[PDB]
Amino acid sequence: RECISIHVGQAGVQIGNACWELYCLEHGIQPDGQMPSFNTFFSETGAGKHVPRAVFVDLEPTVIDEVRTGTYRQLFHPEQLITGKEDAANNYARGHYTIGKEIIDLVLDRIRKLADQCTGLQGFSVFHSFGGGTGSGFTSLLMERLSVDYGKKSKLEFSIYPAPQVSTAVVEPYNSILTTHTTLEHSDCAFMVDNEAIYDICRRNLDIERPTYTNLNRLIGQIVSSITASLRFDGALNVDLTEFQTNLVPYPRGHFPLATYAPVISAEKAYHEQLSVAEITNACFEPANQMVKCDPRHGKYMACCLLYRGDVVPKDVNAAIATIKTKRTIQFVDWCPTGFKVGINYEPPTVVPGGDLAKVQRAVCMLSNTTAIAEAWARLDHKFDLMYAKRAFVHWYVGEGMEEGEFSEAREDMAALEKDYEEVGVDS
Amino acid sequence: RECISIHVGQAGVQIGNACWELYCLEHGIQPDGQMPSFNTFFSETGAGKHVPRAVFVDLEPTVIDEVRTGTYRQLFHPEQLITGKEDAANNYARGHYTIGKEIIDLVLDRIRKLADQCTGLQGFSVFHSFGGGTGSGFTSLLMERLSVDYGKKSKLEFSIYPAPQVSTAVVEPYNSILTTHTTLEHSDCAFMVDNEAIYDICRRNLDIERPTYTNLNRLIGQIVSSITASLRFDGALNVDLTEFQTNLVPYPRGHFPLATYAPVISAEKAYHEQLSVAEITNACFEPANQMVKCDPRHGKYMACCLLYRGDVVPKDVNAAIATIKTKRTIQFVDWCPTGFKVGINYEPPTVVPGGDLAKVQRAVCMLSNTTAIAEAWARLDHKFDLMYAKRAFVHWYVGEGMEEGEFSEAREDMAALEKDYEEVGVDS
Amino acid sequence: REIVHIQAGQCGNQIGAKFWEVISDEHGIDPTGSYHGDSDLQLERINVYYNEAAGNKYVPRAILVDLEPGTMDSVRSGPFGQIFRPDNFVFGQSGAGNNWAKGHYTEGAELVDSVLDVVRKESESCDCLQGFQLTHSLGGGTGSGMGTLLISKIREEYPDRIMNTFSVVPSPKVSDTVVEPYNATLSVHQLVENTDETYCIDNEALYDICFRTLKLTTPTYGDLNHLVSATMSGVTTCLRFPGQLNADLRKLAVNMVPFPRLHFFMPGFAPLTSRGSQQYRALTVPELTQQMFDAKNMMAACDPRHGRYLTVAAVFRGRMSMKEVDEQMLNVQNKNSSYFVEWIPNNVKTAVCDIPPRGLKMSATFIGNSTAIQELFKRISEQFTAMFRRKAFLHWYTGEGMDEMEFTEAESNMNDLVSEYQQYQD
Amino acid sequence: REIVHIQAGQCGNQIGAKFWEVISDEHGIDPTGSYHGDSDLQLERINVYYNEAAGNKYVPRAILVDLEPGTMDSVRSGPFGQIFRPDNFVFGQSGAGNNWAKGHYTEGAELVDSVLDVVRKESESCDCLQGFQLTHSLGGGTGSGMGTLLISKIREEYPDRIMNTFSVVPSPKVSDTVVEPYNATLSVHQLVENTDETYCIDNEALYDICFRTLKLTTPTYGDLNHLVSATMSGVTTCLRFPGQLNADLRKLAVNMVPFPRLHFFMPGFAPLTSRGSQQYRALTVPELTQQMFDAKNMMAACDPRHGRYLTVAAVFRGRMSMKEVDEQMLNVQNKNSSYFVEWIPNNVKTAVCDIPPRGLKMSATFIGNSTAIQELFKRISEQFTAMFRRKAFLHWYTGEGMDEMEFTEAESNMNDLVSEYQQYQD
Numbered sequence A, B: 001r002e003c004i005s006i007h008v009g010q011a012g013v014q015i016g017n018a019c020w021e022l023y024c025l026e027h028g029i030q031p032d033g034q035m036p037s038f039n040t041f042f043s044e045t046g047a048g049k050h051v052p053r054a055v056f057v058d059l060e061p062t063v064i065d066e067v068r069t070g071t072y073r074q075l076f077h078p079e080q081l082i083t084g085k086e087d088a089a090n091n092y093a094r095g096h097y098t099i100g101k102e103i104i105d106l107v108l109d110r111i112r113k114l115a116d117q118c119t120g121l122q123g124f125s126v127f128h129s130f131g132g133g134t135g136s137g138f139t140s141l142l143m144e145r146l147s148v149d150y151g152k153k154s155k156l157e158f159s160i161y162p163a164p165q166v167s168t169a170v171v172e173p174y175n176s177i178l179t180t181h182t183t184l185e186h187s188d189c190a191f192m193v194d195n196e197a198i199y200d201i202c203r204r205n206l207d208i209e210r211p212t213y214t215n216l217n218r219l220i221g222q223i224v225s226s227i228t229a230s231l232r233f234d235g236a237l238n239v240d241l242t243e244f245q246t247n248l249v250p251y252p253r254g255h256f257p258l259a260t261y262a263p264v265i266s267a268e269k270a271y272h273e274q275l276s277v278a279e280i281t282n283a284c285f286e287p288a289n290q291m292v293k294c295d296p297r298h299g300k301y302m303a304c305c306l307l308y309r310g311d312v313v314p315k316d317v318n319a320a321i322a323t324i325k326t327k328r329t330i331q332f333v334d335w336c337p338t339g340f341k342v343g344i345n346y347e348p349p350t351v352v353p354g355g356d357l358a359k360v361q362r363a364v365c366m367l368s369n370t371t372a373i374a375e376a377w378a379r380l381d382h383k384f385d386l387m388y389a390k391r392a393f394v395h396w397y398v399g400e401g402m403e404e405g406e407f408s409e410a411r412e413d414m415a416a417l418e419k420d421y422e423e424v425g426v427d428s
Numbered sequence C, D: 001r002e003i004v005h006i007q008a009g010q011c012g013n014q015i016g017a018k019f020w021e022v023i024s025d026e027h028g029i030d031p032t033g034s035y036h037g038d039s040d041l042q043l044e045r046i047n048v049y050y051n052e053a054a055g056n057k058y059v060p061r062a063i064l065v066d067l068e069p070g071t072m073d074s075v076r077s078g079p080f081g082q083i084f085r086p087d088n089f090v091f092g093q094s095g096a097g098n099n100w101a102k103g104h105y106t107e108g109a110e111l112v113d114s115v116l117d118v119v120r121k122e123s124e125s126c127d128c129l130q131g132f133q134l135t136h137s138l139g140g141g142t143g144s145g146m147g148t149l150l151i152s153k154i155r156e157e158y159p160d161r162i163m164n165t166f167s168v169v170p171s172p173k174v175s176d177t178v179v180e181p182y183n184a185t186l187s188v189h190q191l192v193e194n195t196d197e198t199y200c201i202d203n204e205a206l207y208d209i210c211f212r213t214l215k216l217t218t219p220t221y222g223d224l225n226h227l228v229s230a231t232m233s234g235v236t237t238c239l240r241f242p243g244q245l246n247a248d249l250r251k252l253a254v255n256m257v258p259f260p261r262l263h264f265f266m267p268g269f270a271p272l273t274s275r276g277s278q279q280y281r282a283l284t285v286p287e288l289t290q291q292m293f294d295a296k297n298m299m300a301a302c303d304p305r306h307g308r309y310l311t312v313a314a315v316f317r318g319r320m321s322m323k324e325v326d327e328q329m330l331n332v333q334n335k336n337s338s339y340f341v342e343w344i345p346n347n348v349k350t351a352v353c354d355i356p357p358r359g360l361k362m363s364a365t366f367i368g369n370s371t372a373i374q375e376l377f378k379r380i381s382e383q384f385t386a387m388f389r390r391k392a393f394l395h396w397y398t399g400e401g402m403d404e405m406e407f408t409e410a411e412s413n414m415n416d417l418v419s420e421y422q423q424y425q426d
């Protein structure tokens, strides 16, 4: 019941940096690899050194070099640090093919090595952005090959959603749309997260004046471990990744649950506050704590899963659920009666030294399949239209070999996706 | 059987400052929240810190900042300290709508949070002035929303009555009249208090040369706790807030009981004096101890309720009542035979360190529905007429969107109110 | 909560020099801009008037503007020139010659556009503007001309912000230029439509204060402009420091303006007496109210008792009781009820804050709005008509391009203001 | 990841002199070539611009080229002449006389072949070229002539490498030679087809910066070329040092070029103000963005607000938050949306790295692509037509062998570029 973590691009790697740091914090792992104690993510060598089961890929050396110069470079095996010599210029054409195609075989074989190291691989998780090159384009290439050799193993993807505020590439819509299609084709579950919503949480609930990616990544990393580490460690009601597939995807296409997380409270505001299971879950149904820029009250629910860490009793959860059903404004779709899944571990939430969040006694992760996701898609469609109407910058992809129809096609596929969410939301 | 305290404006907040200080004094609460011991007003966190169930709102930061810099800032939760960035300029138009409308949603949700924290909310009490902006206008807005979501919970309002002496806004009559109407529409019981009558008591019974608001607030705060804390703590004859509704309001409109309180005696004059239950209640029927500038001997009584703290025996009260009936000049209205309600707690009156009143062994709060209240209304009507005759300053509201007829309307509503008090006073 | 201040003309430059001196004293800011205060409260609202520069240094949120370099340089050479940033020195090189037409209409306009860009920059640096403050003359070319142009542009950009101005009012005993009434009339015409309030201070009255009450044999502008700055700082004390009543200027505006066009005010101040007698003083609120009511302590050259009051604002600094202040000010109205207009019950409004002026235990600033003010407008309008009828010197303004009707209409609006005071008078 | 830089003409030679000075400062390289830095990061990407010579000495990957020995010698005589190897000094002995025909077409070609062989040698020594950088004039004979020949040959050999160039743009107030528009037109014609991007800097604007903002009474090229070098080093800071966003020049090219033929850029820089005011500064991202947006801090003589933006790139140096930068730059677009072209949502892109410029805590480089740029082309094309119509001085180029149609077609392509800016403008 092991897994592999794949980090592509700076978005994937920098997030990964916090993720593995967190895993060290969860089990008392020293940077040197020495750890006296997580075998799902680490393998052990005869030296008593543990090695992260992960692959870090960046087509430009730069970020990988950062890894190589950091403290955890002694944790990572040199073969897991793979780099190219030039980026994809924020461009899928290069990421997916022109450049990335020259490295991907190395990458896949290192994955195989790890796959052979694992005895019972449940699956793997991938981190990347939607708008980058390496992070999007290369990622697409990668998933094409992984679904060939692994197939059936869990394909979890964590994708960063381009915000209107932050925008670092003018052709991000194009990059994102191309990517999206391929993730529809090969992922099992995609989680897109909006840095702009996260910033909002950090400035209001963590009270942070000036959020950076380093703080943003800490938040995300903890959420990801609450989903996985928490499954590995055992608790009361353990919930496997295969159950998430089974329970969260009603139709082959609706594989886009979103995440909301609480408690996200600064130490200073946590004093004085004690949240019950019910109260934390009430925070989880608030749009203001949503890690994606959309409105949960607008959309309808199809699936919802709550995972618990630390001090939680099933009974309290049962009461909390009743409250959500009655309080809310949780319009669930007829197609799914009642769909709330509950996983409860005993493992307590962990705290990062030099962190920005309070120590908490219980924590809740909300995963949910809601029709509000279409909203985000609509925003991207529009942006595409504008760029594509003029065909500004199109030569940067076409000149690398892309076909006009490929862009049309991908957009259309997203339009279909959104329409499918509409359809499922239509009660029947 | 819990409650929430809402403090709006400086009048509401500064009064509140003394109120929560008093609650600390009643139960030995440290500024840090630590208290070893009031659950109706406080919730407890796992740290053993207790948090005041209250919301403080000020459209100008200034006063809230004062709170934030005071000792009790460690008691208050940061989310309960809500502020805007500009006042209402003493003007309902802004308080109720232009400015206040932009914050009120925050406020209401924090109220909801507390409402969800309470298990059995009896209701809530609001403190504000009639003449201010935030205190009057914002308050109106607030009550409009609270009656929607809570409805039926107790709506107690404590309003400061503008004195002829103190007058800090030229359009106070206008502010007050607009407010009044809305309080008629949504409060369950309004208590208006005149700082000028209070000053008179402080200079004569407390012997204070120079009263300030800080001394004035102490007096009021104690009265308010004698009504509520005293219900929460249990005594002999406990009297709920719902009983006050039932017993003090004969018709939907007559919801304006006034307060009188005794003993209000300085330490120096209290030596040597011992007041019996009967004697204190005799002080309570004296106009000179009335906290509202009006004449109780002029008006008639419809309802009267006496609440007792400390060392009181029902028998002594029974005798005191007979004395009031026989001594007095308590012309009760035919419509209500005999209407005297008695609540007796065991909880002794408390003393504020550095206070201005003597330690007392028994204390009496008088609530009463009397026709003399019309007098005060008449004064306000006249003042309005003068301003409105010229239409001086009208552009400060109209320019913010108010309608001329709105002012006419509100006055007329007050005229109707006064006439209704007349009618009830007419014996039948 | 922030205020942008602009100094226009020598008057503006020198009065403002004293103003900023005082404000830095209020907050413990030394001439370098460094904070060495006494209290936390000194910093707590420092933002109204200052930007915090690197190193805990502060920069006054204000622009210095003129057409003569020398003046600007003399201000910059003194203490507090160092506190100002170079970015706030906007000036030309040739005065207006006391000509509103040159200041407002032509030359001053050329600088005004750059001033406005600096204004905009500062308003952008602010979190939330409360308003603007201008200091200028009613009779000078840039003070009344340029400054009024600037005002029309600022109000245009910020309709809901408070526009207030302090300005020097001509007097028969002061008058320097023959066209001073011409400049005044033209500025008044514009100010009555484009400001929320203006304070009318007359040097004549100020000289009387200096000698009569302050026992000075040689009144100088250095001290006269000091008295003005006292009143200017008084009006935002509560804004800057915690207190009990009426801190906001808008609140004050609401309570002081009964009619849109009557927005001219009579400032005054207490305690205001020489040191010789101070040893026999005993400040109480009655003492402060006695001095503030007394016309001799008004900074405006006009006795309120000749007219009638529409509004009175009194701002108190320092720890006084609520009763004492509210009883005594009520008593002023009670005792002098014959000088108040019966439309407003409770004509006297008070503001009370907890921080006293450095050196005093308590202090009080008086703002009056009485119909007596019309006399100052009579002095101007009368003098104007004498010149205007003969067109003496008019050619200097017609040389700039001003139309006789421009002046005619300006007069008309002055006449309207007087008539409106009379309508409210009685 | 490596870049080959070439200095052509006096402009190129002197601007590049400052550039290399700065780059060695960036990495702790002394004038001898020895490394004495402060950080490991200084070495970590030193390879972009340097070769490591025996003994931990570094040699700049760049070629110095001209037709006049004296210039070359003067550069070599200064600091940093020592850092260059003899192998990079390629020059003749007779200038072009400001004649593109002599530089491009005839004489300069003779040296270009030897330059190219040195270029090839250096590209062979490199692991992987990222691109090429040229520094030259648009109006001179070797700067525009020889340099453009060299460019056509380099791009020919390396089609996928980034060709960028920085070049000095003629102005009505600068113009030295009568045939300067002729040289410009001919170079433009070639550059528009043969480069990936070019930066348009105008000495006029630079002089204004020096006086207006930097308060210098005597702007000199030594300082003017300093400002250019700041922007030149800014664009590869992230390339050379770790950071968060957009390090690669190609990434920037992708985000800055919406259409193949519109590749002319407007550089600018913040903070850019004299020391006198620096004590009142407080650098924040809003402060840097205010200065970078403001047209007065542009190095190009063109106000963007006259046209409309197609793209904006902002590169930040030093430790700033992600929010602050991304919120504020978004806000620039939000507040000045009227100057952006609606085709591109999110016209402003940012790059942020972690290493500040020596002496500053933070800094920002502005690259704009606005349709306003067409004005610079109008100045050139207009002046050209006046000369061309009469054929004044043409004989000097026809003496070399240039055809009237060569110039005619060159003009045509300039006209195309302006029309394309207009097509995108609106």
Ligand SMILES: Nc1nc2c(ncn2[C@@H]2O[C@H](COP(=O)(O)CP(=O)(O)OP(=O)(O)O)[C@@H](O)[C@H]2O)c(=O)[nH]1
Pocket (backbone or CB within 6 Å): C008, C009, C010, C011, C012, C014, C015, C067, C095, C096, C097, C098, C099, C103, C136, C137, C138, C139, C140, C141, C142, C143, C144, C168, C169, C170, C174, C176, C203, C221, C224, C225
């Ligand atoms: N209380 C004071 N009044 C002053 C002062 N300086 C001038 N004034 C008065 O102001 C008017 C003359 O104006 P200024 O010096 O302000 C003229 P200004 O420099 O604004 O414009 P120009 O026409 O371009 O000279 C007049 O009533 C003078 O008598 C001062 O320092 N204090």
Ligand SMILES: Nc1nc2c(ncn2[C@@H]2O[C@H](COP(=O)(O)CP(=O)(O)OP(=O)(O)O)[C@@H](O)[C@H]2O)c(=O)[nH]1
Pocket (backbone or CB within 6 Å): D008, D009, D010, D011, D012, D014, D015, D067, D095, D096, D097, D098, D099, D103, D136, D137, D138, D139, D140, D141, D142, D143, D144, D168, D169, D170, D174, D176, D203, D221, D224, D225
């Ligand atoms: N910002 C700067 N512009 C310069 C400098 N030197 C020259 N120039 C500008 O460049 C153009 C003149 O060019 P040069 O000195 O570069 C001519 P070059 O030596 O390339 O060729 P020849 O025709 O063989 O002399 C013109 O716009 C000058 O005004 C400099 O040092 N800095």
Ligand SMILES: Nc1nc2c(ncn2[C@@H]2O[C@H](COP(=O)(O)OP(=O)(O)OP(=O)(O)O)[C@@H](O)[C@H]2O)c(=O)[nH]1
Pocket (backbone or CB within 6 Å): A008, A009, A010, A011, A012, A014, A015, A059, A087, A088, A089, A090, A091, A095, A128, A129, A131, A132, A133, A134, A135, A136, A160, A161, A162, A163, A166, A168, A195, A213, A214, A216, A217, D244, D245, D246
């Ligand atoms: N949460 C989070 N988001 C990040 C982080 N780094 C980058 N991003 C976001 O991911 C996107 C940036 O992708 P890039 O860094 O440009 O590119 P890349 O995906 O690494 O691959 P290349 O384009 O080839 O360099 C933007 O939308 C950023 O806001 C990070 O550390 N944390």
Ligand SMILES: Nc1nc2c(ncn2[C@@H]2O[C@H](COP(=O)(O)OP(=O)(O)OP(=O)(O)O)[C@@H](O)[C@H]2O)c(=O)[nH]1
Pocket (backbone or CB within 6 Å): B008, B009, B010, B011, B012, B014, B015, B059, B087, B088, B089, B090, B091, B095, B128, B129, B131, B132, B133, B134, B135, B136, B160, B161, B162, B163, B166, B168, B195, B213, B214, B216, B217, C244, C245, C246
């Ligand atoms: N008893 C008592 N009355 C007070 C206190 N503070 C103010 N008041 C009275 O309440 C009224 C003042 O309201 P303001 O302080 O002007 O205004 P506000 O209601 O806080 O709201 P804004 O007008 O928007 O500032 C006057 O009638 C005062 O006499 C206080 O602490 N205690």
Ligand SMILES: [Mg+2]
Pocket (backbone or CB within 6 Å): A009, A010, A011, A058, A060, A063, A087, A134
């Ligand atoms: Mg990258």
Ligand SMILES: [Mg+2]
Pocket (backbone or CB within 6 Å): B009, B010, B011, B058, B060, B063, B087, B134
């Ligand atoms: Mg208030």
Ligand SMILES: [Mg+2]
Pocket (backbone or CB within 6 Å): C009, C010, C068, C071, C095
């Ligand atoms: Mg002057």
Ligand SMILES: [Mg+2]
Pocket (backbone or CB within 6 Å): D009, D010, D068, D071, D095
């Ligand atoms: Mg030369």
